[PDB]
Design an enzyme around this catalytic site. Sequence first.
Site, short mmCIF file in Angstrom:
data_model
loop_
_atom_site.label_atom_id
_atom_site.label_comp_id
_atom_site.label_asym_id
_atom_site.label_seq_id
_atom_site.Cartn_x
_atom_site.Cartn_y
_atom_site.Cartn_z
N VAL A 26 26.48 33.68 47.59
CA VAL A 26 27.54 32.96 46.91
C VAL A 26 28.87 33.41 47.51
O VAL A 26 29.88 32.72 47.36
CB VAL A 26 27.44 33.20 45.37
N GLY A 27 28.86 34.55 48.21
CA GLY A 27 30.07 35.12 48.85
C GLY A 27 30.22 36.64 48.76
O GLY A 27 29.50 37.32 47.99
N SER A 28 31.15 37.18 49.57
CA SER A 28 31.43 38.63 49.68
C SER A 28 32.92 38.98 49.67
O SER A 28 33.77 38.10 49.68
CB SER A 28 30.79 39.23 50.94
N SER A 30 29.04 41.93 46.66
CA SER A 30 28.53 40.65 47.08
C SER A 30 27.74 40.11 45.89
O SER A 30 27.30 40.88 45.05
CB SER A 30 27.72 40.80 48.34
N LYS A 46 25.51 40.66 40.89
CA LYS A 46 26.51 41.33 41.70
C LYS A 46 26.04 42.73 42.05
O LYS A 46 25.71 43.55 41.17
CB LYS A 46 27.92 41.30 41.04
N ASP A 161 36.56 38.11 36.12
CA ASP A 161 37.43 38.55 37.19
C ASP A 161 36.59 38.86 38.46
O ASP A 161 35.92 39.88 38.52
CB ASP A 161 38.23 39.74 36.75
C1 LIG Z 1 36.80 40.90 30.56
C2 LIG Z 1 37.63 40.70 31.81
C3 LIG Z 1 39.10 41.12 31.72
C4 LIG Z 1 37.71 39.20 31.99
C5 LIG Z 1 37.03 41.28 33.09
C6 LIG Z 1 35.81 41.04 33.73
C7 LIG Z 1 35.86 41.79 34.91
N1 LIG Z 1 34.94 42.00 35.94
C8 LIG Z 1 34.01 41.06 36.26
O1 LIG Z 1 34.19 39.80 35.89
N2 LIG Z 1 32.94 41.36 36.94
C9 LIG Z 1 32.06 40.50 37.49
C10 LIG Z 1 32.40 39.40 38.26
C11 LIG Z 1 31.40 38.58 38.82
C12 LIG Z 1 30.06 38.87 38.52
C13 LIG Z 1 29.06 38.03 39.07
C14 LIG Z 1 27.70 38.34 38.78
C15 LIG Z 1 27.36 39.46 37.99
C16 LIG Z 1 28.38 40.31 37.47
C17 LIG Z 1 29.73 39.96 37.73
C18 LIG Z 1 30.72 40.82 37.22
N3 LIG Z 1 37.07 42.44 34.89
C19 LIG Z 1 37.58 43.31 35.99
C20 LIG Z 1 36.92 44.64 36.06
O2 LIG Z 1 35.79 44.76 35.62
N4 LIG Z 1 37.60 45.67 36.57
C21 LIG Z 1 37.15 47.05 36.43
C22 LIG Z 1 36.83 47.55 37.84
S1 LIG Z 1 38.31 47.56 38.72
O3 LIG Z 1 37.92 47.79 40.34
O4 LIG Z 1 39.30 48.56 37.85
C23 LIG Z 1 38.90 45.97 38.62
C24 LIG Z 1 38.93 45.52 37.15
N5 LIG Z 1 37.80 42.11 33.81
#
Ligand SMILES: CC(C)(C)c1cc(NC(=O)Nc2ccc3ccccc3c2)n(CC(=O)N2CCS(=O)(=O)CC2)n1
Length: 332
Positions: A26-28, A30, A46, A161
């Site tokens: 789906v992209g990187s 990853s 992920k 995010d």
């Molecule tokens: C609740 C809200 C604010 C909306 C949220 C969700 C997420 N993170 C997230 O959506 N993870 C994903 C994205 C795609 C995925 C696709 C498939 C499976 C899991 C997946 C998980 N963040 C950012 C975060 O965790 N950090 C913390 C780490 S950091 O490097 O501090 C950046 C912010 N914030």
Amino acid sequence: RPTFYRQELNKTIWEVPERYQNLSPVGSGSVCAAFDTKTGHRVAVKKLSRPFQSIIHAKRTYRELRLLKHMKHENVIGLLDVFTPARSLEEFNDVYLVTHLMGADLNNIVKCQKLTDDHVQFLIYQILRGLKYIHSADIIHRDLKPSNLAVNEDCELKILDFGATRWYRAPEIMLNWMHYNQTVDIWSVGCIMAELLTGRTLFPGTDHIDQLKLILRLVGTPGAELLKKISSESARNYIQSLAQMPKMNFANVFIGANPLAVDLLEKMLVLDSDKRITAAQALAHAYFAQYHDPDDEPVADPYDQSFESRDLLIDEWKSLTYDEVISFVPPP
Ligand SMILES: CC(C)(C)c1cc(NC(=O)Nc2ccc3ccccc3c2)n(CC(=O)N2CCS(=O)(=O)CC2)n1
Ligand SMILES: CCCCCCCCO[C@@H]1O[C@H](CO)[C@@H](O)[C@H](O)[C@H]1O
């Protein structure tokens, strides 16, 4: 404990329980689409990149797991699963997270479909509803934008995010103000809602300074009440460099839009972050009369963020991350 299998995808190794089949990029991290046989639903997996490479990476990894494990709301990404190949803390090097596969992001939707006023209300409603929840955990998104908004074929939406962003960004973040209240995300919602209404990016800035110049053209130079709260001697002068722009009348700017939508936009795109409508107040706004339900806009369990102030060793973060993988309980 499940049995795992190994697959190489675009030079990346993926070791996942057999539960999950048909991995497909789906992209990187990853991210792969996959089919979950224990449910017959499709998912997104992920693989965290380099979870433990530095103390900072390690605290990020821990931050993400804790946050995603806490988020339990219909308009916010949730965790279906979290796993690692490791049989033990010594082996522990990789984290995988699992959530519902969603079909498209809001950009995709806006590009090939002019939304009706009803669509804008439902989409914006749902963003505020997930935001009311996230804000109630004392979390700030900080990068809300259409590519971070997953939308199904029934136009249902989830905030997440994936990790130009500048187009939806509050002017205080681009002047690195450092405090930031949660209404920076409200700024972002006004940008997104303006775009759902016109089909066009509201502030398509070329770079950092163009971004600010475009913002000031709509909402005007800081008025006396804002200038009064700016402690920074430097900032004050830098501002009073910029051309003396009047605030535009939004009714004139979004010409054929619902007057309730315009009024909400006026209350979101305020330079002063103390004067911006909150997510909970916006949900009470008359533009959402048809969707608003005060008994179905839930808030979060208290969220222990004391880890944020801690400076710990890599292996301590790693051990904390491993504890949270172990204690995970999948949703119903
Ligand atoms: C609740 C809200 C604010 C909306 C949220 C969700 C997420 N993170 C997230 O959506 N993870 C994903 C994205 C795609 C995925 C696709 C498939 C499976 C899991 C997946 C998980 N963040 C950012 C975060 O965790 N950090 C913390 C780490 S950091 O490097 O501090 C950046 C912010 N914030
Ligand atoms: C020229 C560009 C002007 C940018 C003005 C952004 C001011 C946003 O608002 C400011 O937000 C801060 C929170 O971070 C608060 O501490 C201040 O009380 C508030 O007025």
